[PDB]
């Protein structure tokens, strides 16, 4: 349980379902963009257009 | 372009493809578990078993 409190299960490759809350968080309309940043063990998802830490 | 440097496009609902590097960062084999935490505009993914910040 977290802020979103949702855990996903990798398909088989690594594909999972990100929440509308992620689409809402960033800017995602139907595909838009989500680029990830790895931190220690964790993964950081953010849209491409909004330049953040990289 | 970031640590992983990979950006995804949502399918339609919110599903995208997370990298092997995510399975490797955490501890995902084929499905395992990835729970996300939303922070400001961004999303924070980590395995369920290892209880980090929540």
From Swiss-Prot, chains A, B:
<keyword id="KW-0238">DNA-binding</keyword>
<keyword id="KW-0804">Transcription</keyword>
<protein>
    <recommendedName>
        <fullName>Putative transition state regulator Abh</fullName>
    </recommendedName>
</protein>
<keyword id="KW-0805">Transcription regulation</keyword>
<feature type="domain" description="SpoVT-AbrB">
    <location>
        <begin position="5"/>
        <end position="50"/>
    </location>
</feature>
<dbReference type="GO" id="GO:0003677">
    <property type="term" value="F:DNA binding"/>
</dbReference>
<comment type="similarity">
    <text>To B.subtilis AbrB and SpoVT.</text>
</comment>
């Amino acid at each position: 349980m977290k802020s979103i409190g949702v855990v996903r299960k990798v398909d088989e490759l690594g594909r999972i379902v990100m929440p509308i809350e992620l689409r809402r968080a960033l800017d995602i309309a139907i595909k838009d963009s989500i680029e990830f940043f790895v931190d220690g063990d964790k993964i950081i998802l953010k849209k491409y257009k909004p330049h953040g830490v990289c």
